[PDB]
Amino acid sequence: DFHFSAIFQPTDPHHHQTEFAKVEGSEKYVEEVEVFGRQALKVNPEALTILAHRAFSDVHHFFRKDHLEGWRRAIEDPEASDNDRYVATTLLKNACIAAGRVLPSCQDTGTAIVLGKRGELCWTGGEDEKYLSKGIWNAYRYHNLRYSQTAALDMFKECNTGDNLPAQLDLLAVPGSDYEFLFIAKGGGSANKAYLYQETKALLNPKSLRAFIEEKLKTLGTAACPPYHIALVIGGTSAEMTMKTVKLASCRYYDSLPTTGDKYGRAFRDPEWEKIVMEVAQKSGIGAQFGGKYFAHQARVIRLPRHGASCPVGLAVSCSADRQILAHINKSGIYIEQLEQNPAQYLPTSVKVDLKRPIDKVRQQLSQYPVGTRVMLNGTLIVAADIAHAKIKEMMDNGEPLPEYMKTSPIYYAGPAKTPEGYASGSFGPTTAGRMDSYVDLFQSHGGSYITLAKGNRSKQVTDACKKHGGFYLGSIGGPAAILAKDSIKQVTCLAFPELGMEAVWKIEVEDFPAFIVVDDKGNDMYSKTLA
């Protein structure tokens, strides 16, 4: 006989385990009515604007307790490495700055994602996408965030949209008369560490699956600012469903699923395999960015049904800029998840490098030290990320020289958020280094980019380039954009390509800017053992 079984059967579908705050007076936006014997809720669509505006403000200044507790664990665990403790302390101090509500926790204020669940009898007037987008627009326009969206005018010609739109608006039709939401401000670096694998039944045994996990976790590297919330989804009804599920799992949205399967194919969380993922992450030695135990805060593993011919697998992370917030609109008004507004309660050796010297003397100083050495940088950085590198390569392909401004100072891969009134800099942490790997040998062959500063492990071509050309790659801590702006970045000026907005080439002056020597001029790489 027919038995309907929903794939997802959370025991807490409305997220009662989360603490919510009411938006004061917001009952004025809703009215209970009855039509054809059924209870319905009229919702003024301005409620959607108000809610999205608050969500995409709050999430940039505060974190959940589970995330903060993870950093505290990395500080207090005797098994944490010294670098684990240093990185987690830096990230907690960054969170304390961000809680001042001026500087966002990361310069990459993300793509705005809305998962909405509109009841059959929740009546908004139907212009939900426009009103949510207006709230998002307000959040990014009137706060010190960043416009991160790139429009395609044609296949290759691009421009920044200038407002962090469009958003990803996934509005679902569900039972009832309420409107439920998950808002995510998703960083690009962690979005890029969402991977889909097309596997088979041959994977589905303990030995094969553990070996697969060990291999795939290393491909995350440190490129998305660990400690990570790691999510792994085994199975699914389509690739897109697997990838949606792994995103939501990384946001802890599926924490209340059953922990056993059944003959109807329901989804389940698998605590045994979560523990295995954590053991693999800890034993990998990758650590909280620079070697140790704290590659991961926690793990979520969701097993899904599959077509017999298929086994899609999703792997994804939430990075240090772990930013999501639940909300709902009901007969009592607008409710939004309460994040931790006092992160300070979770709080309990270097070589000084003067960059205000000829770059060849800086190279000479760095050559004295092994990979893993912590340095403190003082002086000028030239800032250039993806679009600037591509434009400069295009100029060189058309016969122009590498610009002189690429030869005078170390190159910092970064893109700043907007500058608060009275501040020298907005949040201004590093970009993922690996995306620039194809340029390093070329630029060094033309006399520049001998020292680069960014975050994440890099490919072998960069290690080889630095050995051939007497170069270095310095790893900033990834994620602490607010404390870097507040304490280290003293002056920012636009140097080239002003038309590119935040993706222009900048000239910045820094003090006490921490980094580790990741790649030296001798063929060595701090990550060569843990990310072999």
Add this chain to the structure above:
Amino acid sequence: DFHFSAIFQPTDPHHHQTEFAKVEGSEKYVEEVEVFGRQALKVNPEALTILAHRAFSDVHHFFRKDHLEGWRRAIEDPEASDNDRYVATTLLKNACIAAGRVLPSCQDTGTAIVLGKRGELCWTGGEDEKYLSKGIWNAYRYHNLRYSQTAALDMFKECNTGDNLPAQLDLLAVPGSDYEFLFIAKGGGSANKAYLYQETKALLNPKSLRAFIEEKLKTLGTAACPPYHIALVIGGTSAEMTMKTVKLASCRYYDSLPTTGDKYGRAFRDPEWEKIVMEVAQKSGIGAQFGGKYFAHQARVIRLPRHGASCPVGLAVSCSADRQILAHINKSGIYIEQLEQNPAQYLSVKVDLKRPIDKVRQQLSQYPVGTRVMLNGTLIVAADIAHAKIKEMMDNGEPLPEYMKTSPIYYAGPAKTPEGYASGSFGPTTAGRMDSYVDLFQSHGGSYITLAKGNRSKQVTDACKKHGGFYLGSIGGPAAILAKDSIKQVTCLAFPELGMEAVWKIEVEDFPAFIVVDDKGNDMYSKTLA
């Protein structure tokens, strides 16, 4: 100033370009009403059951014109190879048999996927998932389809659900008072050829993008029964959004998008790059399964906005079992897309298996790869779970079973047998998924001859050379004509609890195949899919 711009701005959002038939009497399930001054629609949820049942019945017996036209093009084009024409003719003849409404076009009757768009003022009572699922359950239970869904009792212990549930039910909240749908019966093999790449700005130039397309298309191989509808999505707001978009593009759901971008980041189809994809597909020589020009029916390329730090890319195909139906419910009733009910308007070495296997191997050794053969005799049928169970038995010290040593191994899983028929639809599954077993099984005295579809990895070529084996490629997709004309007896041999994934013993006549891998290190795909 603020300007809202939806990412997707089709000029034909309601699919007016599609022809629909109304389900007779279905106005009884709907009532137009007015609530607080706006137009609304009451829908009896039984309409959802009726609609899903009809959609997931019709789609297994009929195709769209764009798909059928592609097979005709492959036959009529002087530049098509002989193998292109042979494969396209076989697939058209298969479609003619499926249009008899008894045998489905493919044994893999797919995962049931529903994209639904429920208007704000379309009121069903809210139990939409249950009522849609009942209609799907009805379609798979009361017709000669297949139960393809595998439930996980724990991480590794699995069972077939026995009813082709659960479905993928993606129900969206949209403006208005109607209910619009795309139903997809998605085969596993083409589902597996949905790929996500995480790229960078360094890809976004003509030379790099062309080279990327040329490399990634080859990774599709023939493993999802081409000619393909190829979809490519460049950009997206997340990996899952890129992958949803490439799925929908492959279903021609986004055909009416704009063809230029703007400063607000709207999605667009890119005809220039569609033409480039088609040029790459034709020049690859991969062909309609066995070399030629007809790797692809057509291409869809959608360019999306992206976060400056990100460039997700999706690549996906619709296979020979190209199965989707549009539908809508409105104040007049239930409307369902009309597919082509008259596909007919669009129109070797004999190998006796009734011998010791060593004699069959000796005969096959006389011929080069690319030779077309006709098989007559017993095939032993075993796919993914059966292979895993047999490996496990051997790892625990048990023999390779006798039934892996007597006959060619056909990798397949049958659909249900119609009353009065010898066999349900019964075409091949993708060979590559069994590659990890070939050397092992041959080392232990069996699986010397395998029969399936798709190009295989180098380990299989090496195994067949080391052990004196062969891989035979059936045409991929023509499951109904194979069942009607070639399969004479079917018996479950082992592991009956696995449903369609049991081991079967079948007796066949006139079963066509090509020698893809021989016993000498040669592979029919080595030039085109190196």
